[PDB]
Design a protein around this ligand. Structure first.
Ligand SMILES: [Mn+2]
Ligand SMILES: [Mn+2]
Length: 165
């Protein structure tokens, strides 16, 4: 019943592994990654991730179709689009790389989802803005802010918390 959240891994292999371990060692049914993986080899490291993967395309993600195939050879369930609007554990999700703010803003203001997830900015935030649970797990790589993070969301109690690496 635990969903893993992460973003902007920017090829940092170490922190990527540290997150892939932290996730396994827990429930974590699925892992949302809205970030810029940035390079194809990042996808191999994930072959070691127990849960499945719902990813979004970061704007730096060059190999757009290679990433998709690869993510699948790793698992048929794994999905990756520019925008993913799904329902999970009886909850409406809108996931996207922080990329396009206009669409992000409207997903929140709209009132069609319960939970909204994005990244891009590298600034982790965790706020409730009109019933909407808005989450940016921050930068797994820790490059711009120097604070490397990821996060786990409780789909049951609607509870969440950051994890520093
Ligand atoms: Mn970005
Ligand atoms: Mn980025």
């Amino acid at each position: 019943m635990k969903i893993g959240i992460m973003s902007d891994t920017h090829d940092h292999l170490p922190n990527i592994r540290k997150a892939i371990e932290i996730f396994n060692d827990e429930n974590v049914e699925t892992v949302i990654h809205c970030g810029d993986f940035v390079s194809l080899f990042v996808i191999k490291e994930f072959e070691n991730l127990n849960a499945n993967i719902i990813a979004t395309y970061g704007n730096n993600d060059g190999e757009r179709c290679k990433l998709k195939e690869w993510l699948k050879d790793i698992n048929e369930e794994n999905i990756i689009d520019d925008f993913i609007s799904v329902e999970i554990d009886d909850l409406k999700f809108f996931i996207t790389h922080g990329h396009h703010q206009s669409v992000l803003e409207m997903a929140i203001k709209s009132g069609l989802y319960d939970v909204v997830i994005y990244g891009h900015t590298h600034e982790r935030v965790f706020e409730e803005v009109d019933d909407v649970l808005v989450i940016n797990p921050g930068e797994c790589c820790g490059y711009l802010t120097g604070i490397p993070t990821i996060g786990i969301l409780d789909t049951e109690k609607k509870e969440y918390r950051e994890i520093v690496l």
